[PDB]
DNA sequence: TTTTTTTTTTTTTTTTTTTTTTT
């Protein structure tokens, strides 16, 4: 979760498909703050896929910053 | 000064849009936070049995005047409603509200 | 307009004055809303005639369908509202026209409605005084 | 222009003057039922009186032609426009206007009429957002329900002694 | 300098009073269209010159666009649009649209020339109108027009030579 | 420098009262287009130089576009347009549009020659016209034109070349520096 | 420095008086380019020399703002080219003029020679036309019909 | 510093006198109808004579390759250059230089020749506008008749 | 002042000799150079061997402010590898440009023929 | 639940030959 980073840091973070009945989408997720480190995310309804994409990439992105 | 760093961790009691706006207006002030729309995309519009089904994405960016910001995503749906305009309206507005809700949560527990 | 820092007295007056909820005189009906001209007047009396600014970031036409001689339109507008200090809120608004035998009139009605709605919904983010206490 | 700060007294005078309504000598009605409106040139005059000939500016951000359609030799045109009005201190309001031509047999005349009408309508709607004094009171139902030239000084010579002596 | 030099109280007041005034029957021309009344563009140029001075105002073309060129029965039908901006010595400005038109000519270049000139002239006329009634804004008032309808050049000192002794002396 | 130097009171007043003048019948040319009247470009340049001085104005070209280059029976038809901007020492300016037309020539380089030069000439003429009656703004008036047509027809004259320049050196200018 | 140095009253008066002159009969060349008509003109180097005397070797400057080839065409093995240029002339104080010059090249069977000629001619023509707006001493007097009719009957 | 140093009256007058002089036969070359010109190093040394080693500068603004054509295994290349010369006072001149390479089967050699020739042609045509001592006289048809 | 007259009176060819000449004529801290534009002309890896063409613009500027810009050029042929070939063309082009830039100052630093 | 009258004629001929060796 973002709680660990928000506690330690204090950081800001910026930001395809498959499509029948199963979904998977790209990420376009970046992170800033010090310099930036970018990552990418995966998914698993389009809303659920996009949201999950954004979760994981941030998680991976924060790790690299660390 | 230094008060917000401790006033963000507290939680009290899903959250309605107006309530998160009202709490936003308090910690930072009416002139302490701003939000913007970065993108909207009508992913699909479908017609079945005279009823329309819509799904829309939205990119919402929230910045504190200090500089820090968090862009997040939101989605909106409108199922089983005749007429397209109402469907698109509901989906777009719900998308923006949801993106705003999820954007603000990244600054701490309080929001 | 863009770097005019607020003074403490006016800052506190604004912060206290925004939270006041709207009395029954303003609200009209079912759904309870606020007319656009009332919102403009409240903004003028709240920040000053030179304390806020609004613009149109972009506007899109979603469709124009003709069915039995009648036109159906939908228009999306992104309306941005700015204060003299540098704060802003952008929000979306929609406009609809149905049953009109003229395409140009339909487009006009839709575009203007979308702009007005975006303006209404963009000001609400500032405080309860302007309409946040309506739902 | 763009960086001129209002004085306190001018601020207060304009704030009080904008807050008031318009008498029955500024409103006209047309059949549509009936609709009450304020003509564009009167709004320009009111803006000049309120802010001065050098107190406000207006610009066309972008226009676009929505459609040109021909039916039985008649052209139907719809034109949009974005108009931005600004004040000396920096404040501004942008609004949309729309123009229409219906039954003209000449395409060029139709485009001309539509574009000019769109610009005028957009300016009228952009000036409204500054107060009741500039037309914001005519769409209020209560006010509408409640409501319901000598040429001796006309300029006859080019030369203007007063301005030139003051120059 | 232009765009950064302010007015003074006296000049500013005089210009307000002058701009508030209307125009007389000798500034007005009529044409069939059942008549229509208007002000010629060169008259407006003169009025602007003597209202703000020869160096008090500046205009520019910010955009011009051809809408269509069409041939029918060997004749060209053209339509052009122009955005004209008028600016004042303090920084104020008014931008309006002009539109030109040409129809019935058998030459394509002549049609484009006429239309593109008419566009800028009309746009300048309409941009100067929003500074006051003196600069043409009063022509749109029906009461003024019906008031005018109820009403009842031998310059031998023309410039003959090329030099300006007084201008050279002052320079 | 240019664009940052202001007029003095006497200078401004003199130029203001001079620009109000209307040109006499010896600046006016005629051509058939019904007869039409005009002022030739080099005369306009001379008038501008007298009014503001050789260092008092400046003109440029902001854009030029060719509308069309067609071919018909081996003969080219060309059309060009220019945006000509004229400026003064204080900072003022005026812009206008000039159009150049060429038709009938078998060569294509010559057609663009003529069109592209005529366009800039016309643009400069019209950009200077909006400074006063003295720089050509009076020709548009019907009253002023019907006055001239009632004046006597002045016969053509011949200039005297006894004062013409015949040596590159300019002793007065050299002494001035 | 160049571009921000002011003329003195005497220099302004002198240059103003000088530029009003009309050039004598030795500066006018001639051609046969009217299909039965003659045309007068002034040579380039002569105009540069006149400018150098009037303003001095450090009183003026010029540049090229843009140049573009309208067309390079081939017909019967021969190249036809047309090039246009915009030339800006400036004075020591800031005044400037800009006009258009056009170069032509019809007949040559080499592509490089045609382009060379067209470009160089266009730039020189532009420099000539820009300097023409400063006065009669720099070629503005040629367009006069009366002035030429006087020379042709000397 | 350069670009902001003014000329004294004596220096300006001396240079003004010099640049009006025409060029003798020891500077004019010829070729086969007949043509005359001045070599690049000649004009460079003349410029160093008038303005001095630290009294002038030049630079390249635009170089564009008009074409690189290959026919019969033989390249034809053309390069156009714009060169700019300025003095210490601030004055400047700019003109177009050209380079032509033909017949060389080696691509790199043709390109090198054209690119290097264009700069020098433009530099010669830029210095010409300062006066007669830097080649401006060569265009004088009467002058050539006198010298020839 | 006297230094100006001295230098003016003082004012193929092997490479480093010209850099030594510039060092003596103007001094170790009297001149500088920089690379402005680089370009590559034609294709590479033809018939095993490579043909590389690189042209460079070099600007030499003195302490007072005088400067000169000239064009170099570089050619690589025979070497059957992209590696260190285009680099060789780059180095050759830069050196040729520097030599041609130092030439325009005077005879002591070039002026062939 | 927003929102619904505007537009008013202009354009006036110009263009006038150059270029040509270097790394
Ligand atoms: Mg013309
Ligand atoms: Mg020519
Ligand atoms: Mg050559
Ligand atoms: Mg309408
Ligand atoms: Mg019209």
Residue numbers in the entry:
A (entry chain I): 67 to 76, 84 to 88, 95 to 98, 100 to 113, 120 to 130, 134 to 155
B (entry chain H): 36 to 48, 65 to 162
C (entry chain G): 26 to 54, 62 to 167
D (entry chain F): 26 to 57, 61 to 176, 186 to 204
E (entry chain E): 25 to 57, 61 to 179, 186 to 204
F (entry chain D): 25 to 57, 61 to 204
G (entry chain C): 25 to 178
H (entry chain B): 25 to 56, 61 to 176
Paste lines from the article.
Central to these functions, RAD52 promotes the annealing of complementary single-stranded DNA (ssDNA)8,9 and provides an alternative to BRCA2/RAD51-dependent homologous recombination repair. Instead, cryo-electron microscopy and biochemical analyses revealed that ssDNA annealing is driven by RAD52 open rings in association with replication protein-A (RPA). RPA associates with RAD52 at the site of ring opening with critical interactions occurring between the RPA-interacting domain of RAD52 and the winged helix domain of RPA2. Our studies provide structural snapshots throughout the annealing process and define the molecular mechanism of ssDNA annealing by the RAD52–RPA complex.
